[PDB]
Design a protein around this nucleic acid. Structure first.
Ligand SMILES: [Ca+2]
Ligand code: NA
Length: 276
DNA sequence: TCGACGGATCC
DNA sequence: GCTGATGCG
DNA sequence: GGATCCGTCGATCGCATCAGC
């Protein structure tokens, strides 16, 4: 079935207006996404922080259009060291964060340009591009090593300040989070080991799944559709991109959106509203 | 993701 | 410069 | 014993890069 995201809810459950709009988006090749007019959409959506994943672009090749974003003038990039046109993430913010770091404090996992951390007054924001488990699960062993290291690291962070984690976490948590759960139980993104890892990340830090806190019963809500087999037009997709929130930010949560119509990638954008 | 193929399983 | 592969999703 | 379910397989799209010439 198809799915219509409901209108933006911009008031907290205590009547306070939203003061921060975070937009996350796996662009799957920054340079191609630019040509497919993805920055035009970002300009209209006008967020305070933009998080992009799977950038496939070294910083010395960063397109010139990124210099035409006045409301997003503070930009931070993490490329891999060895591989080219592979992974890479970006974090752009209207105001300058207090401190910016890269990776998760573990040498084995900081080589691929997947994590950026920005600290603000009231919270720390982590944007993430979690390693896919791979065709034939030939990275699933590494991904469990990732999940373990990443979970610990985030718990350390969330114990200091309220944490927002956004990005492509490369797993559909429950059956409701993808269109064909029955047939994907041994494919990357829906194995038992990645599903449990996600549940463990939720229960251990702890963190809530913003979208599921607000619409626990809503199915057919996805952020990725394969380019093949005309999946996007049949809404045969996966929910892979998340805003994960500290429980102490839930009183501040106004809405968590899935921007289904915005093209440019095999992922769509998600955006978070918070009253801070 | 989807189709085509053989090989169970079902009342 | 073209064409069609590869690695990775 | 006609139908339906089952688990493999292969190919499919796109980006960025490379091989070859
Ligand atoms: Ca020749
Ligand atoms: Na290559």
């Amino acid at each position: 079935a198809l799915y219509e995201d409901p209108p933006d809810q911009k008031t907290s459950p205590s009547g306070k207006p939203a003061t921060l709009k975070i937009c996350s988006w796996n662009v799957d090749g920054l340079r191609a996404w630019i040509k497919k007019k993805g920055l035009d959409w970002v300009k209209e959506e006008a967020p305070d922080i933009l998080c992009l994943q799977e950038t496939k672009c070294s910083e010395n090749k960063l397109p010139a259009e990124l210099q035409e974003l006045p409301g997003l003038s503070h930009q931070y990039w993490s490329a891999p060291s060895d591989k080219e046109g592979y992974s890479g993430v970006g974090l752009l913010s209207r105001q300058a964060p207090l401190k910016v770091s890269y990776g998760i404090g573990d040498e084995e996992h900081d080589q691929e340009g997947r994590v950026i951390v920005a600290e603000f007054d009231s919270f720390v924001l982590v944007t993430a591009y979690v390693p896919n488990a791979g065709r034939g699960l030939v990275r699933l062993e590494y991904r469990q090593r990732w999940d373990e290291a990443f979970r610990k690291f985030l718990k350390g962070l969330a114990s200091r300040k309220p944490l927002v984690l956004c990005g492509d976490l490369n797993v559909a948590h429950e059956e409701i989070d993808l269109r064909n759960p029955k047939g994907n139980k041994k494919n990357a993104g829906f194995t038992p080991q990645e599903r449990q890892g996600f549940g463990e990340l939720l229960q251990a830090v702890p963190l809530a799944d913003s979208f599921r806190h607000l619409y626990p019963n809503t199915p057919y809500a996805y952020t990725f559709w394969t380019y093949m087999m005309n999946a996007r037009s049949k809404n045969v997709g996966w929910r892979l991109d998340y805003f994960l929130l500290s429980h102490s930010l839930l009183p501040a949560l106004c809405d968590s959106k899935i921007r289904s119509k915005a093209l440019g990638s095999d992922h769509c954008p998600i955006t978070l509203y918070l009253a801070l």
